[PDB]
Design a protein around this ligand. Sequence first.
Ligand SMILES: Nc1nc2c(ncn2[C@@H]2O[C@H](COP(=O)(O)OP(=O)(O)OP(=O)(O)O)[C@@H](O)[C@H]2O)c(=O)[nH]1
Length: 1095
Amino acid sequence: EELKEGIDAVYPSLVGTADSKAEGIKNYFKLSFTLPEEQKSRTVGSEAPLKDVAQALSSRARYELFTEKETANPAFNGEVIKRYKELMEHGEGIADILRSRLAKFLNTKDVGKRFAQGTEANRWVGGKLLNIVEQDGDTFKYNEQLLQTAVLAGLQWRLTATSNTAIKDAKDVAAITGIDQALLPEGLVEQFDTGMTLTEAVSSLAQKIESYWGLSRNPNAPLGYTKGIPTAMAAEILAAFVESTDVVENIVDMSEIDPDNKKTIGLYTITELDSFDPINSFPTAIEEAVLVNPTEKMFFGDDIPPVANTQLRNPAVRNTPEQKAALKAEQATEFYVHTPMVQFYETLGKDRILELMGAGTLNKELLNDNHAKSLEGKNRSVEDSYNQLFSVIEQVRAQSEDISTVPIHYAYNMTRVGRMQMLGKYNPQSAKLVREAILPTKATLDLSNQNNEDFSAFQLGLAQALDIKVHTMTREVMSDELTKLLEGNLKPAIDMMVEFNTTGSLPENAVDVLNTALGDRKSFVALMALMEYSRYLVAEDKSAFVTPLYVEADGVTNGPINAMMLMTGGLFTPDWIRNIAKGGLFIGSPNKTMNEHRSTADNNDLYQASTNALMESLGKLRSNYASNMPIQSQIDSLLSLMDLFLPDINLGENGALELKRGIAKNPLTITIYGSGARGIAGKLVSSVTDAIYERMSDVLKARAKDPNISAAMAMFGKQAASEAHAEELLARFLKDMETLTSTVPVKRKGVLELQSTGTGAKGKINPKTYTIKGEQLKALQENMLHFFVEPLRNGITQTVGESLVYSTEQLQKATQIQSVVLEDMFKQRVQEKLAEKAKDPTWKKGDFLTQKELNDIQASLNNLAPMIETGSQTFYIAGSENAEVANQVLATNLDDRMRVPMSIYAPAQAGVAGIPFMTIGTGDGMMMQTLSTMKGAPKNTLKIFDGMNIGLNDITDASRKANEAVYTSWQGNPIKNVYESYAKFMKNVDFSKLSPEALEAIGKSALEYDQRENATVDDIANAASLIERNLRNIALGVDIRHKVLDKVNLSIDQMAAVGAPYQNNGKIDLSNMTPEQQADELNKLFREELEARKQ
DNA sequence: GTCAAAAGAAGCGGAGCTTC
Ligand SMILES: Nc1nc2c(ncn2[C@@H]2O[C@H](COP(=O)(O)OP(=O)(O)OP(=O)(O)O)[C@@H](O)[C@H]2O)c(=O)[nH]1
């Protein structure tokens, strides 16, 4: 244990004694950190890191010498060297800001003088940086090595942090702001997706600084310093960046939106470099110079990414051997730049791509104020996607004379839900624009004959890209439908692309030609299709046409179908057989494809089935209130408003109701995953308001282009035939808005009752400022909930089966009950340990527990089985990062601001997280994992969770393997996996040791409403073990069903499009049988197996 | 309560209570 001397040699002049038992000033940097066994950072021991690395970055030969490599990244040329010289000089500036801030901190309130006299200011929340200072005269100064290395990390973060930030949805913004997800004002989500919160900016910064420091944490040192000192350094660098205008600080006030919300939230945005910046072509030069094993970098040629050991943001969960092999298989896949599409993007230009694929140039007075904010977010996405692709291209272009032959590899990690995800925000897997420029798919096709199987594959790839629903029709019908389109509407776009692949130029009206020809088919993959087809037409050798065009083996209602197959526990019903067929499980029909099923057997998928069930449930709700005219008129209004703006809702001339699969897509998926009805209603209202705000922009665009046009024609002219027909549509809109915002349905004793809000919408509409806010959004939501959503939920249940709902409820309850105990015991063991440390003189409050002490508490929970094992997958549902455990500030900056909460990796309440965890995990997660590791695993693909892009040459076998992987996935039993660990939890849990806050939470899940309030510990313990019993019976049932189903002749085409189903070769033939006959025969085998286990 | 990642600022004082 001579490591005390080791780090003292490196940092001898730091203020303080390197022992916690000393009485003077104690140096907590040398107590918290040690030198690593093997070198991590090349700046360790350097007198002046900024000078040393600047010298390294000054030339290619010096960079090669510093990194001890023979050859350096060829993108690091003359222009890039010039820009790094300038960024290095900027590092000197940030370092200079940091020094003046320290000086100011030492002077204010005579802290410097007090600290020199013995005051332990280095243990304050805002003074932990005094652990890295040195004595200089009658004052203090930074340790230059530590300061400059931190600045270097700050510079790398400044360059690439934005391309690594997480995408924030509406739910995320809701959690930050404290405003209900449904009631969020327009554009606010866009504001918070562009910015970084305090914790977001600091944690990413502190991660960099600490790694750049290149030291190991001391397991026996308090978290308040091990995690606190680099966080303190991060907070100061951020404050320095605010001063230099590299980062813009925005304190957003919530009382401007929701007056009784008192949150003021800091939002931080990194100033973007101009996209033509030479540094964009190689932004990881510092990272690759400082670190022996750099995180951030592109992987070219045969430089393959390492395989991550632990689950993403779950350090307690190790990736299984099978998961690691999958991650290796995907990281081995070579990606290639498709030059034609890059050239196409480049020729169109950023502006015209924004025009074509976004909203283009915004006229902020021909646009509704709320509608403009949606369009700003649509442009931001496309523009950032465009810049980020061309930053990659520029680096790729430098690797070789031909870009199309440079192999690119991508890093992957396994998430909490067992999904293989490409790291970085804008990659082929996450960005559609990038997806069409960098492909792993490629094939040499014989297209000299339009009767080749190669040309059939080519047609399938074009049709799917052009928005033809290829899984709904056979290949032959697909072929004819593609021809009609190519020779019809697309012809002028094809002609324009033919000329582009001849002269290399586009016409001035390019956006117009593409927009008119594609219409609703407009997507990036559709632009690929026009490109690849026109390239084929001009091709010199059609016998050997090289193309990255792909076919996606796409899961048909993947989530819901997986849940139905994996978690239904009862006896087989005839409805289940018909409904599961909608997802590709065909019983007693050898070689049946999804194509044949949709065209000859059943054209309704699971979304449509639930939509038709919603229609039936609406008719049953109307009967219950047949004489109640106000209620009948209220349903009529909601449906009138939806029909008016949404394509999926249609009302006939005689009042006939027609609903399309569209409105059920998102609700069906999230309902099963445990989403509440109110969240669904909010989203439905949000898509209604979106279309209304958009229509207001259309009004202004008509009013300015014709000041004589009526308000009715301006809003409904594109829909109606005459003036009076438009006026009655305007009459509908104003009527519907009034009654739906002034009256709401409330459920009293199981009976719906209408109530006045007293906040109804009325007044002359101003199409510019028109906004539906606060009480009015809540009103529409209430009507949507009781008249549309609740009927749909009943329809969803009817479709997927009550047996599945029961299972998911049991799964949710079990995992919730377990997570509450884990969270509470952890918190209590933390408080137990913090009580002990108070009786310690060397310890002080503000310091936390040591990592070793936190490992002791985590390991003490092993008997409660926090992990769920499948044999090939591991899940930790409770696992989270949260500030509730420490409940204290970790560090502040030197202005007493930027107060970073101490986040601890600890268990938390699961909520309904258990359901998507297991469904996605053992469903699509397990499928893709299998698809990467199986015997004869499809190569050169791009996996996107429930869909796989395959090269045109291998569409047949890859699709069959995919369906085989689905079948393998359906051998899983997630409920058994949950039961296995919940049973261990039930044998070791003491419910009495739980807090009354935690005890009530378990009561919510375990007991019926009437029994909660104040039940005994023995009462909730009995109910918890009842759920254990329930789990066993479900798991028993799922196991039997799977075994029984395996004995029967099956054709599986869930990953549909190509028409290549997997056959299980079950010996028991069930052909020429009705679902009713099939159910009876399957149940005969069920009880046969059930009595075999019995004895 | 879908999930795939969390997440208020700041004066006075040196923690954590407090007000916007
Ligand atoms: N867990 C989870 N997965 C999602 C969610 N949204 C999308 N996904 C998955 O992420 C994948 C993204 O697919 P993309 O190819 O990027 O396109 P898309 O998201 O389907 O966008 P659209 O085509 O407009 O519907 C999908 O295959 C989904 O399975 C979500 O909200 N939660």
